[PDB]
Nucleic acid binder design. Structure first.
Length: 163
RNA sequence: GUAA
């Protein structure tokens, strides 16, 4: 809907193919999970710049999956295909300060109040997920667990949702 | 300028 390519699938023959790293963290509290954001907040977006312009300035550092842009408020939310690519953008993109773009972490999944915006992950109690959040976590194309069920300590990348 |  807000994705560049709507119906696409996370498979070998897509050049957008990414693995789904799942790990387990024994320090998380009971019935809690950890989700790494794939969503970037971009502020200072000039009025003349549109969705395609943002996708293209980031292309050297990351393949962009979706852009949601509010030109009036001069910010956008950009989802990239993997955590690694998001981390890559935050270090290496616009180091010179040429573009007026301020790049920070955003949240695409779970409640805002569970997100550490400095490190870009959410420690979420399972009771705060909706039924849809649970479904998307296991069944999403990019991110999620790829069938592995949700249990205490599980760590995955932000799953695609449906909005 | 942290949203759907």
């Amino acid at each position: 809907n807000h994705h560049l390519y709507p119906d696409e699938l996370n498979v070998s023959n897509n050049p957008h193919y990414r693995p789904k790293p799942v790990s387990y963290d024994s320090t998380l509290p009971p019935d809690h999970i950890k989700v790494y954001s794939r969503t970037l907040f971009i502020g200072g977006v000039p009025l003349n710049m549109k969705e395609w312009d943002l996708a293209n300035v980031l292309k050297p550092f990351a393949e962009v999956q979706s852009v949601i842009l509010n030109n009036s408020r001069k910010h956008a939310f950009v989802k990239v295909y993997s955590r690694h690519e998001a981390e890559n953008v935050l270090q290496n993109f616009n180091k010179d300060g040429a573009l007026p773009l301020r790049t920070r972490w955003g949240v695409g999944f779970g409640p805002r109040d569970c997100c550490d915006y400095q490190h870009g992950y959410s420690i979420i109690p399972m009771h705060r997920l909706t039924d849809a959040d649970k479904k998307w976590s296991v069944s999403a194309q990019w991110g999620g667990t790829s069938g592995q069920p949700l249990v205490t300590g599980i760590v995955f990348e932000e799953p695609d949702i449906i909005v």
